[PDB]
Amino acid sequence: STIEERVKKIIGEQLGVKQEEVTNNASFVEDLGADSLDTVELVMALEEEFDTEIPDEEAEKITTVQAAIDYINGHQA
Ligand SMILES: *P(=O)(O)OCC(C)(C)[C@@H](O)C(=O)NCCC(=O)NCCSC(=O)CCCCC
Ligand SMILES: [Zn+2]
Ligand SMILES: [Zn+2]
Ligand SMILES: [Zn+2]
Numbered sequence: 224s225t226i227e228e229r230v231k232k233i234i235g236e237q238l239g240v241k242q243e244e245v246t247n248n249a250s251f252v253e254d255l256g257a258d259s260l261d262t263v264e265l266v267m268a269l270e271e272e273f274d275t276e277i278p279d280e281e282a283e284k285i286t287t288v289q290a291a292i293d294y295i296n297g298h299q300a
């Protein structure tokens with residue numbers, strides 16, 4: 224499995240969106256329909272899966288699927 228596949232799987236599960244809709248360019252809010260609680264839960268789900276903590280102000284700027292994948296590749300240890 225790749226990081227892209229694992230991250231997309233988690234986003235879809237958390238937001239209640241079908242896999243085909245979770246495209247790399249998709250905006251969590253504008254395209255995937257995420258609300259305020261979804262942001263919190265999606266961030267914690269990804270921090271748990273990839274055992275990494277992202278500052279909340281930084282997470283707020285991660286607005287697309289690809290930006291989440293990029294952060295994980297850049298910080299997962
Ligand atoms: P509500 O009115 O309180 O908040 C609505 C907002 C639009 C402000 C909130 O949903 C928000 O700020 N959304 C921005 C996009 C988003 O959901 N970002 C988080 C994406 S996932 C992430 O950053 C995790 C990266 C990997 C960490 C290991
Ligand atoms: Zn693999
Ligand atoms: Zn949908
Ligand atoms: Zn968009």
Ligand SMILES: [Zn+2]
Nearest residue numbers: 258259260261
């Ligand atoms: Zn909600």
Ligand SMILES: [Zn+2]
Nearest residue numbers: 267270275276
């Ligand atoms: Zn934490």
Ligand SMILES: [Zn+2]
Nearest residue numbers: 266277278279
């Ligand atoms: Zn946080």
Ligand SMILES: [Zn+2]
Nearest residue numbers: 273274299300
């Ligand atoms: Zn690790």
